[PDB]
Design a protein around this ligand. Sequence first.
Ligand SMILES: [Mg+2]
Ligand SMILES: [Mg+2]
Ligand SMILES: [Mg+2]
Ligand SMILES: [Mg+2]
Ligand SMILES: [Mg+2]
Ligand SMILES: [Mg+2]
Ligand SMILES: [Mg+2]
Ligand SMILES: [Mg+2]
Ligand SMILES: [Mg+2]
Ligand SMILES: [Mg+2]
Ligand SMILES: [Mg+2]
Ligand SMILES: [Mg+2]
Ligand SMILES: [Mg+2]
Ligand SMILES: [Mg+2]
Ligand SMILES: [Mg+2]
Ligand SMILES: [Mg+2]
Ligand SMILES: [Mg+2]
Ligand SMILES: [Mg+2]
Ligand SMILES: [Mg+2]
Ligand SMILES: [Mg+2]
Ligand SMILES: [Mg+2]
Ligand SMILES: [Mg+2]
Ligand SMILES: [Mg+2]
Ligand SMILES: [Mg+2]
Ligand SMILES: [Mg+2]
Ligand SMILES: [Mg+2]
Ligand SMILES: [Mg+2]
Ligand SMILES: [Mg+2]
Ligand SMILES: [Mg+2]
Ligand SMILES: [Mg+2]
Ligand SMILES: [Mg+2]
Ligand SMILES: [Mg+2]
Ligand SMILES: [Mg+2]
Ligand SMILES: [Mg+2]
Ligand SMILES: [Mg+2]
Ligand SMILES: [Mg+2]
Ligand SMILES: [Mg+2]
Ligand SMILES: [Mg+2]
Ligand SMILES: [Mg+2]
Ligand SMILES: [Mg+2]
Ligand SMILES: [Mg+2]
Ligand SMILES: [Mg+2]
Ligand SMILES: [Mg+2]
Ligand SMILES: [Mg+2]
Ligand SMILES: [Mg+2]
Ligand SMILES: [Mg+2]
Ligand SMILES: [Mg+2]
Ligand SMILES: [Mg+2]
Ligand SMILES: [Mg+2]
Ligand SMILES: [Mg+2]
Lengths: 48, 62, 183, 52, 109
Amino acid sequence: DKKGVQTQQRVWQTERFDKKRLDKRSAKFVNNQPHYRDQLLQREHHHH
Amino acid sequence: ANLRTQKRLAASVVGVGKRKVWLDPNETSEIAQANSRNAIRKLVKNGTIVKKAVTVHSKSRT
Amino acid sequence: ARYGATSTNPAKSASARGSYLRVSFKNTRETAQAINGWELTKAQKYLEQVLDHQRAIPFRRFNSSIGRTAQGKEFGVTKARWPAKSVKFVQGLLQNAAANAEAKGLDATKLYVSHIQVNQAPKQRRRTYRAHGRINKYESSPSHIELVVTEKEEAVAKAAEKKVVRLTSRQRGRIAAQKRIAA
Amino acid sequence: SEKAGHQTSAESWGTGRAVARIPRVGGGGTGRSGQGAFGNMCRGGRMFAPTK
Amino acid sequence: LKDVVTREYTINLHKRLHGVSFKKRAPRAVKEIKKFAKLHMGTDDVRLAPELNQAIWKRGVKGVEYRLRLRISRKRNEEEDAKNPLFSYVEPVLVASAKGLQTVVVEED
RNA sequence: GAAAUUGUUGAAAGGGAAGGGCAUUUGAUCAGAC
RNA sequence: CGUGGAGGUCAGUGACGAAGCCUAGACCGUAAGGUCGGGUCGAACGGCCUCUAGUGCAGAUCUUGGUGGUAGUAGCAAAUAUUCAAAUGAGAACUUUGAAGACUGAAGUGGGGAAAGGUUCCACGUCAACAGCAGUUGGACGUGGGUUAGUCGAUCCUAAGA
RNA sequence: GUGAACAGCCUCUAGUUGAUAGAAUAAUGUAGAUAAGGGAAGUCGGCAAAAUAGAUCCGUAACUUCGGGAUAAGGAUUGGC
Ligand SMILES: [Mg+2]
Ligand SMILES: [Mg+2]
Ligand SMILES: [Mg+2]
Ligand SMILES: [Mg+2]
Ligand SMILES: [Mg+2]
Ligand SMILES: [Mg+2]
Ligand SMILES: [Mg+2]
Ligand SMILES: [Mg+2]
Ligand SMILES: [Mg+2]
Ligand SMILES: [Mg+2]
Ligand SMILES: [Mg+2]
Ligand SMILES: [Mg+2]
Ligand SMILES: [Mg+2]
Ligand SMILES: [Mg+2]
Ligand SMILES: [Mg+2]
Ligand SMILES: [Mg+2]
Ligand SMILES: [Mg+2]
Ligand SMILES: [Mg+2]
Ligand SMILES: [Mg+2]
Ligand SMILES: [Mg+2]
Ligand SMILES: [Mg+2]
Ligand SMILES: [Mg+2]
Ligand SMILES: [Mg+2]
Ligand SMILES: [Mg+2]
Ligand SMILES: [Mg+2]
Ligand SMILES: [Mg+2]
Ligand SMILES: [Mg+2]
Ligand SMILES: [Mg+2]
Ligand SMILES: [Mg+2]
Ligand SMILES: [Mg+2]
Ligand SMILES: [Mg+2]
Ligand SMILES: [Mg+2]
Ligand SMILES: [Mg+2]
Ligand SMILES: [Mg+2]
Ligand SMILES: [Mg+2]
Ligand SMILES: [Mg+2]
Ligand SMILES: [Mg+2]
Ligand SMILES: [Mg+2]
Ligand SMILES: [Mg+2]
Ligand SMILES: [Mg+2]
Ligand SMILES: [Mg+2]
Ligand SMILES: [Mg+2]
Ligand SMILES: [Mg+2]
Ligand SMILES: [Mg+2]
Ligand SMILES: [Mg+2]
Ligand SMILES: [Mg+2]
Ligand SMILES: [Mg+2]
Ligand SMILES: [Mg+2]
Ligand SMILES: [Mg+2]
Ligand SMILES: [Mg+2]
């Protein structure tokens, strides 16, 4: 059935686009981490 | 010819580990018909499927 | 339809195009420029040899940090590769365009690739995972490839000289003199 | 409408997170979280001198 | 031209596997053996016989033998024309020790 | 169906950036003319 | 000078192409901008006299969306290890079988369960996306099937407690 | 099976052979190693590494809350038949 596979052809290709919008609209702040603590700390060196 | 099913069956039917089972490589077409625990039991008695011998551990040294 | 820029007579040329191919864009752009301008059967026999590591594809634009190779020498470049997957999709097209040239009843021996162009198709997107719990885009760079093969004609030799001679009253009289001198 | 653009919980992240000071939507796991909020210049935020 | 031969070569693995990473030795035997047999009889498509494969491995990935004595035949390819008309086939030959023997052409009947 | 950005063709230039101002040569190109 | 709307007016322009966009093509203006030509395009839109304002952007670590250089680069290196034939297939380093070599070595990489999950179980069909290589394979995708109690649990009893 | 041992190392029953591959083997690496003579001269500091180690027999001080210290320190033996 060509009628058949043309249709699950479209849907897949439509769907897959709409999961792209999601990874992009999310993308900007996805790395937002309140309360992130840097593993690395550097002593500020000065003598009073 | 994907035999991963029939090899899992034979193991249960012949009452032994998968690793001791042996499927005749020339009957591959044949075995592919199995698909049922009953079918398999023909194939065991028939001889086209076989139980390999336990690998030998001798105590003779000890 | 609606191909890229064409200098070709449409009746004597056959064309084929794939779209949304899963291949590097940067890599295909490289294998494209390679076989551009060549005679068709040359192109194919050559692409064959690249699969074998006999010849190579010179990387002339996106080369950065590519390795040096001997095989580069042929085209006078030190940076070259053998992009297998690119080559497949180009072979696949060249085989096709050669078939369309057949059902158009053109002469196969006189064919050569006139115009071959590849631009970038919409990115596709997965995620990857980075230290300190971050996320990054991890992306395919699909391509559209189009190619037009032509039947070679050296048959054009045209003489067009358009003479509008603007001469002053002085230059006319002065050409006159030279004619009275029996030159 | 006077509620407009104010329907949100947004706060400022304060400085130190390397981005503009403008109050952003807290929360997570949606497109909208983190985005700019209120402000007259922000998508979705309140307009300047709302018509009364 | 290429005519349908059979010979019996000894190959020295020990000089060919010299200094190789232990875990990869058995496999380099198999690329070596292939390479060797494409040298002589330039057939370019080779196939090992599974028992030759045991003959290599019989000692485990480290301990490959110093000398093998193999029988290499050059045969006609079939069907589905491969990019070559000709074909190479290796299988081992049982012997006491592979020492001291030289290449012999096997008469074929 | 704009822009960034990108491919092909075409034209041009290029000795550690490019771009701008004043003036003209060279090439391309175009209005007024009656 | 420019923009969204409003009253008036040119019995203004328009499917014989309105607006929009494109144009190292032309003209007007000191300039804000205005006007014509060509290409695209397909339904509405301008001049003038006045009214009104959510009315002009290069910047705000501005806001939302989009895209580069970087760059075919960094990388894909813990847990010892794969190899040969055949079948399948358009296609086989990676699927299935045989052979071989190996490892977990009973405080297991084995057989069962608790919390949690929720159909992942199992067959048939399938390869667009997913399995940071591949893919004929799959905890993926499509169509179905499957969980049987007088005795195993809950149910009943009380504990610290509510 | 070794062994005091549920330690480490090898196998049997069951289970995996899944962790992107190929070709070469430069620098610098990461992990693992060995070094003549000297023996801490290195460094803020013996940090890191080396030495020692099991069992049996001998021998075992100062001090002490008399229980310890103590495996003190220091020696000798170890296979096969
Ligand atoms: Mg942005
Ligand atoms: Mg590099
Ligand atoms: Mg460089
Ligand atoms: Mg990562
Ligand atoms: Mg985490
Ligand atoms: Mg609003
Ligand atoms: Mg070495
Ligand atoms: Mg459109
Ligand atoms: Mg552009
Ligand atoms: Mg106006
Ligand atoms: Mg308004
Ligand atoms: Mg128009
Ligand atoms: Mg322009
Ligand atoms: Mg405003
Ligand atoms: Mg604006
Ligand atoms: Mg702006
Ligand atoms: Mg400003
Ligand atoms: Mg900014
Ligand atoms: Mg980027
Ligand atoms: Mg790299
Ligand atoms: Mg990976
Ligand atoms: Mg790494
Ligand atoms: Mg590993
Ligand atoms: Mg593997
Ligand atoms: Mg082991
Ligand atoms: Mg269970
Ligand atoms: Mg399953
Ligand atoms: Mg299946
Ligand atoms: Mg993949
Ligand atoms: Mg794939
Ligand atoms: Mg499912
Ligand atoms: Mg009853
Ligand atoms: Mg009960
Ligand atoms: Mg014992
Ligand atoms: Mg033990
Ligand atoms: Mg181990
Ligand atoms: Mg398991
Ligand atoms: Mg596997
Ligand atoms: Mg890994
Ligand atoms: Mg080299
Ligand atoms: Mg020393
Ligand atoms: Mg010494
Ligand atoms: Mg000393
Ligand atoms: Mg010192
Ligand atoms: Mg010192
Ligand atoms: Mg210190
Ligand atoms: Mg120390
Ligand atoms: Mg003491
Ligand atoms: Mg002692
Ligand atoms: Mg003794």
